[PDB]
Subunit: 141 residues, 4 copies
């Protein structure tokens, strides 16, 4: 809640800006390390998590359309928030593109992203970058 609301950064400096509402809503924007690269997001989170050391389940969606570009696709992230001095949101994502029926087999990509509250540097932003980046962001996005 207090912990989820705010700005989050992935492995590559992509930026997730989110407000967690009292009622379980997630609202915000997803962008790159640029208004051309900013997209609306919305989701849900468990607003009354267990108090046993478990993470807080959540998920959200970005449709990759804004006033500048349309990639005809949408990503959903499913994951959990873990608070603390090194707070993280660990996720798995699915990126589905609109396709014809014949191409439906290649409609959905899968991956994983970890978000933290401190912006990374180009060192760990490029090394880790050579480690295999995992944006669920289509290039056009």
């Amino acid at each position: 809640e207090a912990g989820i609301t705010g700005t989050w950064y992935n492995q590559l400096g992509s930026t997730f800006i989110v407000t967690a509402g009292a009622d379980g809503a997630l609202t915000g924007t997803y962008e790159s390390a640029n208004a051309e690269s900013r997209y609306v997001l919305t989701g849900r989170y468990d607003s009354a998590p267990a108090t046993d050391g478990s993470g807080t389940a959540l998920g959200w969606t970005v449709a990759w359309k804004n006033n500048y570009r349309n990639a005809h696709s949408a990503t959903t992230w499913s994951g959990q928030y873990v608070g603390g001095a090194e707070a993280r949101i660990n996720t798995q994502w699915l990126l589905t593109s609109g396709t014809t029926e014949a191409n439906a087999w290649k409609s959905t990509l899968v991956g994983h992203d970890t978000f933290t509250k401190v912006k990374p540097s180009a060192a760990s932003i490029d090394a880790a970058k050579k480690a295999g980046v995992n944006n669920g962001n289509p290039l056009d996005a």
Copy 2:
């Protein structure tokens, strides 16, 4: 848009009630074949799809908390809408439970759901049911 807004039914009679807004918002509820089993959903969809026979990309999230139960989990569906006389929404989903760090390996289930606009019968609602149902709905939900 006109085509996505409305009530959708999965393989097992689970019910997805959604409004597609002009701006790309999805808002609605997810429920069983019961207010105890109704949960808020929110998502995004491509409000300006290609006109080449491709589907419309979309996704949405349910956090499995309502005023009756809390499963401490959230499902995201990623998929595409295909319109027509047998309109469908084909999806893949991820169900992540809040877990401790040690149990994070079993935090996320994966599956697939197809939604159509006509409510199925118990025949095809139980056969197809013996065919292996795929709700992304945790039991407590």
Copy 3:
């Protein structure tokens, strides 16, 4: 399950795999789209002693999409379970990973699902499947049309 799994399996698009289930848990065979150019080696594992409570039989297999004719520089894994009976079926989830550059790693893996039965589908069935959007885990480029 050794006897129940061994044999030819079809998806609803007609893709075919031929597998031998070994007593030791091995799965060995081929996956094909009809012709040799579309046929690939498969190998995997299955639970050779599953629970005796009505549960399915966990299994998985891999196909690397290289044979003596073509190479799609990719590989698919299928993870799922066998259910025996007069309508025996293998329900799976698959992952198709392509070799890519580092920059393209994030878009290296497709995910999908597919179901196999022992009954060859008719063109009819094959036509409605295609209609319900194709679910195969083979890349089209593995297919010699």
Copy 4:
């Protein structure tokens, strides 16, 4: 890649697999959590002639979680790619499917990711990994503690 893949690989929690890459594309070996009771047969496939453009080497493998000691009635597949070099690495996505009843089929398959390198992690590294939430694709019940 036959030479680069053959050998022992570790995840950041210390799980280990030992694989031989055959010239023909086969992957053969074992997966273990230290002791025999936690060791399982693996088999898979890899692209034995990958692209010559900087791309990785597509591969996959399966482990059914049955050995001579225990049986978890499940199987995992890993799909991913090998990247060679002084910091050689195998990046994967995995699917862990348990045999279940029909009613529980919807919750039969876990998904996750894991990365392997040729360097055994220290307890330190192992401790921060555990901290960053465990990513292994083996069920705990496959592990003899």
